[PDB]
Short mmCIF file of N, CA and C in Angstrom, two decimals:
data_model
loop_
_atom_site.label_atom_id
_atom_site.label_comp_id
_atom_site.label_asym_id
_atom_site.label_seq_id
_atom_site.Cartn_x
_atom_site.Cartn_y
_atom_site.Cartn_z
N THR A 29 171.99 70.91 104.94
CA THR A 29 172.26 69.67 105.20
C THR A 29 174.26 69.98 105.10
N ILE A 30 174.61 69.39 104.50
CA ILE A 30 176.56 69.70 103.65
C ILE A 30 176.27 71.19 103.32
N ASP A 31 174.93 71.55 101.92
CA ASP A 31 175.52 72.32 101.25
C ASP A 31 174.37 73.16 101.75
N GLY A 32 173.81 73.45 103.25
CA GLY A 32 173.03 74.43 103.45
C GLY A 32 171.50 74.13 103.65
N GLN A 33 171.09 73.17 102.60
CA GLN A 33 169.19 73.40 102.31
C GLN A 33 168.81 72.31 103.22
N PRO A 34 167.38 72.50 103.98
CA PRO A 34 166.83 72.24 104.58
C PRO A 34 166.33 70.87 105.14
N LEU A 35 166.31 70.21 105.78
CA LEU A 35 166.22 69.04 106.17
C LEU A 35 164.05 68.82 105.72
N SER A 36 163.77 69.35 107.17
CA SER A 36 162.35 69.89 107.37
C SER A 36 162.05 71.35 106.73
N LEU A 37 161.09 70.71 105.67
CA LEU A 37 160.74 71.14 104.95
C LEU A 37 159.27 73.49 105.30
N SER A 38 159.21 73.79 104.04
CA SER A 38 158.83 75.12 105.27
C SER A 38 156.26 74.99 105.15
N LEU A 39 156.77 75.77 105.89
CA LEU A 39 155.09 76.35 105.03
C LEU A 39 154.50 76.55 104.36
N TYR A 40 153.56 76.66 103.80
CA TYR A 40 153.07 76.55 102.54
C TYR A 40 151.05 77.23 103.48
N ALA A 41 151.14 78.41 104.49
CA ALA A 41 149.48 77.94 104.41
C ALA A 41 148.31 78.36 103.50
N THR A 42 146.94 78.37 104.24
CA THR A 42 145.93 78.07 102.85
C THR A 42 145.94 79.69 102.34
N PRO A 43 145.51 79.69 101.86
CA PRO A 43 145.23 81.81 101.35
C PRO A 43 143.84 82.26 101.29
N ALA A 44 143.70 83.35 101.58
CA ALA A 44 142.04 83.92 101.69
C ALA A 44 141.81 83.18 101.05
N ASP A 45 139.70 83.44 100.93
CA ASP A 45 139.38 82.42 100.13
C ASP A 45 138.32 83.82 99.27
N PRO A 46 137.85 83.16 98.26
CA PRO A 46 137.47 84.64 97.72
C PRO A 46 135.83 84.72 98.59
N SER A 47 135.91 85.54 98.74
CA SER A 47 134.76 86.78 99.37
C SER A 47 133.31 86.77 98.16
N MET A 48 132.12 85.69 98.50
CA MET A 48 130.88 86.68 98.10
C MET A 48 130.33 87.62 98.15
N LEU A 49 130.09 88.61 97.14
CA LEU A 49 130.28 89.90 96.86
C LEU A 49 128.15 90.32 97.21
N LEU A 50 128.35 91.99 98.06
CA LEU A 50 126.47 91.21 98.46
C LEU A 50 126.56 92.74 98.52
N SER A 51 124.89 92.91 97.79
CA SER A 51 124.54 94.31 97.78
C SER A 51 122.96 93.76 98.27
N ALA A 52 122.42 94.75 98.29
CA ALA A 52 121.07 95.24 99.04
C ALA A 52 119.73 95.93 98.71
N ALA A 53 118.46 96.43 98.40
CA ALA A 53 117.91 97.38 97.41
C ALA A 53 117.03 97.17 98.65
N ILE A 54 117.42 98.25 99.53
CA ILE A 54 116.55 99.35 100.18
C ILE A 54 115.50 99.95 100.29
N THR A 55 115.35 100.31 100.78
CA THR A 55 113.21 100.69 100.40
C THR A 55 113.42 101.48 101.35
N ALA A 56 111.91 102.68 100.87
CA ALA A 56 111.59 104.02 101.50
C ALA A 56 110.67 104.51 101.02
N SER A 57 109.37 104.76 101.94
CA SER A 57 107.45 105.29 101.66
C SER A 57 107.50 106.67 101.66
N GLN A 58 106.93 106.57 101.26
CA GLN A 58 106.20 108.15 100.52
C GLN A 58 105.10 107.87 101.13
N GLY A 59 104.56 108.76 101.53
CA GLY A 59 103.04 108.30 102.67
C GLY A 59 101.75 108.06 100.78
N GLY A 60 100.61 108.44 101.38
CA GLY A 60 99.05 108.56 100.06
C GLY A 60 99.10 110.12 100.86
N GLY A 61 98.74 110.60 99.09
CA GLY A 61 97.64 112.01 99.41
C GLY A 61 97.08 112.51 99.97
N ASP A 62 96.34 113.59 100.85
CA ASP A 62 95.53 114.18 101.81
C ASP A 62 94.81 114.62 100.28
N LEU A 63 93.37 113.57 100.92
CA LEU A 63 92.38 114.22 99.46
C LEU A 63 92.15 114.94 99.75
N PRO A 64 91.87 116.65 98.87
CA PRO A 64 91.35 117.55 98.99
C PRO A 64 90.47 118.56 98.88
N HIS A 65 90.28 119.22 98.85
CA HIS A 65 88.26 120.37 99.32
C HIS A 65 87.70 119.50 98.20
N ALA A 66 86.50 119.27 98.50
CA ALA A 66 85.64 118.95 97.12
C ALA A 66 85.25 120.42 97.17
N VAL A 67 84.30 120.68 95.84
CA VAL A 67 83.78 121.61 95.62
C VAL A 67 82.59 121.37 94.68
N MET A 68 81.42 122.13 94.51
CA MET A 68 80.07 121.25 93.86
C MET A 68 79.92 122.31 92.85
N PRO A 69 80.08 121.39 91.91
CA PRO A 69 79.32 122.70 91.03
C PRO A 69 77.97 122.75 90.28
N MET A 70 78.46 123.63 89.28
CA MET A 70 77.13 123.61 88.31
C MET A 70 76.43 122.78 87.78
N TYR A 71 77.24 121.76 87.39
CA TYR A 71 75.97 120.62 86.05
C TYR A 71 76.02 119.53 87.03
N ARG A 72 74.35 118.87 86.52
CA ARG A 72 74.53 117.44 86.65
C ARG A 72 75.05 116.41 87.09
N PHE A 73 74.98 115.59 87.67
CA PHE A 73 75.85 114.33 87.73
C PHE A 73 77.00 113.51 85.87
N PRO A 74 75.56 113.54 85.78
CA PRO A 74 76.20 112.61 83.89
C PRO A 74 77.04 114.06 83.76
N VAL A 75 76.59 115.27 83.73
CA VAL A 75 77.18 115.46 82.75
C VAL A 75 79.25 116.29 83.24
N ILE A 76 79.35 116.30 84.76
CA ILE A 76 79.93 116.27 85.33
C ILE A 76 80.49 115.19 85.57
N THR B 201 120.86 129.46 98.60
CA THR B 201 120.08 128.88 98.90
C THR B 201 119.47 128.42 97.54
N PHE B 202 118.61 127.52 97.52
CA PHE B 202 117.87 127.12 96.26
C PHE B 202 116.88 128.52 96.09
N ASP B 203 115.91 128.90 97.29
CA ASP B 203 115.59 130.39 97.33
C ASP B 203 116.43 131.39 97.17
N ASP B 204 115.93 132.17 96.04
CA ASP B 204 117.26 133.25 95.42
C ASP B 204 118.18 133.13 94.69
N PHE B 205 117.95 131.01 94.51
CA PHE B 205 118.14 130.59 93.45
C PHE B 205 117.70 130.61 91.77
N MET B 206 116.28 130.31 92.36
CA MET B 206 114.99 131.27 91.78
C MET B 206 114.96 132.62 91.23
N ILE B 207 115.31 132.76 91.74
CA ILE B 207 114.92 134.49 91.52
C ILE B 207 116.10 134.73 90.44
N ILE B 208 117.53 133.48 90.67
CA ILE B 208 118.54 134.15 88.92
C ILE B 208 117.79 134.07 87.76
N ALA B 209 117.52 132.39 88.61
CA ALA B 209 116.67 132.00 87.38
C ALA B 209 115.25 132.60 86.78
N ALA B 210 115.08 132.47 85.65
CA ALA B 210 113.92 133.32 85.37
C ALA B 210 113.90 135.04 84.72
N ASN B 211 115.20 135.39 85.01
CA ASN B 211 115.65 136.55 84.66
C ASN B 211 115.62 136.68 83.12
N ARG B 212 117.16 136.68 82.56
CA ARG B 212 117.92 136.43 81.82
C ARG B 212 118.23 138.10 81.29
N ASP B 213 118.16 138.85 82.46
CA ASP B 213 118.86 140.04 82.83
C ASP B 213 119.12 140.46 83.78
N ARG B 214 120.22 139.39 84.11
CA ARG B 214 121.80 139.02 85.11
C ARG B 214 122.81 139.97 84.87
N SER B 215 123.88 140.37 86.22
CA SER B 215 124.91 140.25 86.39
C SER B 215 125.86 138.99 85.81
N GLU B 216 127.09 139.60 85.87
CA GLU B 216 128.30 139.19 85.87
C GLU B 216 128.08 137.80 86.67
N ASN B 217 129.09 138.49 88.29
CA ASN B 217 128.61 137.51 90.28
C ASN B 217 127.08 136.84 89.46
N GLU B 218 126.17 137.37 89.04
CA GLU B 218 124.56 137.53 88.87
C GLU B 218 124.60 135.37 89.20
N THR B 219 125.33 135.77 87.29
CA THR B 219 124.77 134.52 86.84
C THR B 219 125.81 133.44 86.69
N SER B 220 126.66 133.56 88.30
CA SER B 220 128.79 133.54 88.04
C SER B 220 128.03 132.38 89.61
N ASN B 221 127.27 133.53 90.63
CA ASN B 221 126.60 132.41 91.58
C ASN B 221 125.33 130.99 90.85
N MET B 222 125.39 131.30 90.11
CA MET B 222 123.95 130.22 89.70
C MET B 222 124.55 129.31 88.90
N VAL B 223 125.92 129.28 88.00
CA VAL B 223 126.38 128.60 87.88
C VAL B 223 127.53 128.09 89.00
N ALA B 224 127.99 128.56 90.20
CA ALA B 224 128.64 128.21 91.50
C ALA B 224 127.68 126.92 91.30
N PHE B 225 126.08 127.17 92.02
CA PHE B 225 124.61 126.59 92.16
C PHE B 225 124.49 125.97 91.81
N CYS B 226 124.82 125.02 89.89
CA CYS B 226 124.80 124.18 89.82
C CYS B 226 125.92 123.54 89.80
N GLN B 227 126.78 123.63 90.19
CA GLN B 227 127.94 122.56 89.64
C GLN B 227 128.10 122.11 90.77
N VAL B 228 127.50 122.50 92.32
CA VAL B 228 128.10 122.32 93.16
C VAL B 228 126.53 121.19 93.27
N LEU B 229 125.83 121.52 92.76
CA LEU B 229 124.96 119.86 92.31
C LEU B 229 124.90 119.21 91.50
N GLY B 230 125.56 119.12 90.35
CA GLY B 230 126.61 118.15 89.50
C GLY B 230 126.63 117.47 90.62
N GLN B 231 128.46 118.27 91.20
CA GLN B 231 129.12 117.48 92.78
C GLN B 231 128.29 116.45 93.30
N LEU B 232 127.07 117.07 94.19
CA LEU B 232 126.12 116.46 94.03
C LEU B 232 125.51 115.11 94.18
N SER B 233 125.35 115.34 92.01
CA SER B 233 124.43 114.12 92.11
C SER B 233 125.99 112.95 91.45
N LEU B 234 126.91 113.63 91.36
CA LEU B 234 128.52 112.58 91.46
C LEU B 234 128.74 111.82 92.28
N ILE B 235 128.50 112.61 93.61
CA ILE B 235 128.59 111.91 94.72
C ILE B 235 127.91 111.68 95.28
N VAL B 236 126.42 111.52 94.96
CA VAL B 236 125.88 110.41 95.53
C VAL B 236 125.50 108.78 94.02
N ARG B 237 125.50 109.94 93.12
CA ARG B 237 125.52 108.10 91.88
C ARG B 237 126.58 107.37 91.58
N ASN B 238 127.75 107.67 92.00
CA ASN B 238 128.85 107.30 92.58
C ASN B 238 129.04 106.21 93.17
N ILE B 239 128.80 106.68 94.72
CA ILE B 239 128.73 105.68 95.70
C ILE B 239 127.47 104.55 95.80
N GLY B 240 126.01 104.99 95.26
CA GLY B 240 125.10 103.99 95.43
C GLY B 240 124.87 104.36 97.14
N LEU B 241 122.98 105.38 96.90
CA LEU B 241 122.64 105.83 98.18
C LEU B 241 120.89 106.52 97.11
N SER B 242 120.18 104.95 97.93
CA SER B 242 118.78 104.81 97.65
C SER B 242 117.71 105.63 99.11
N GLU B 243 118.35 106.90 98.81
CA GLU B 243 117.01 107.59 99.48
C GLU B 243 116.99 107.62 101.03
N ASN B 244 117.13 106.32 101.20
CA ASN B 244 116.25 105.84 102.90
C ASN B 244 118.10 105.83 103.37
N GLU B 245 119.29 106.33 102.90
CA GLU B 245 119.83 105.94 103.17
C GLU B 245 120.91 107.55 103.05
N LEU B 246 120.33 107.80 102.71
CA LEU B 246 120.42 109.63 102.19
C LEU B 246 120.01 110.69 102.77
N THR B 247 118.97 110.87 102.98
CA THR B 247 117.86 111.62 104.51
C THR B 247 117.63 111.31 105.22
N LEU B 248 118.84 110.26 105.55
CA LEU B 248 118.89 109.74 107.20
C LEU B 248 120.46 110.89 107.71
N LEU B 249 120.64 110.58 106.85
CA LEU B 249 122.01 111.44 106.48
C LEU B 249 122.24 113.15 106.68
#
């Protein structure tokens, strides 16, 4: 203008959106235990 | 290693350099426990690496 001020206004672009925070419950695997060696007792079945 | 750290343990008659290496092992274990719990590593992530 006569003072040096613009006629066509400036751009005001859209800022970045707030994101959604993400996590994860990652999982592992330990196997089952190997069954041991059986030992014959000296007592009968009700006692042992 | 963790072997020969077991032997420095359970003595109670150990030299100053021996217990110094012992404290070194324990505080590198502490640096490990921090370096895992501060970032979060749920062991499928960690034992891979």
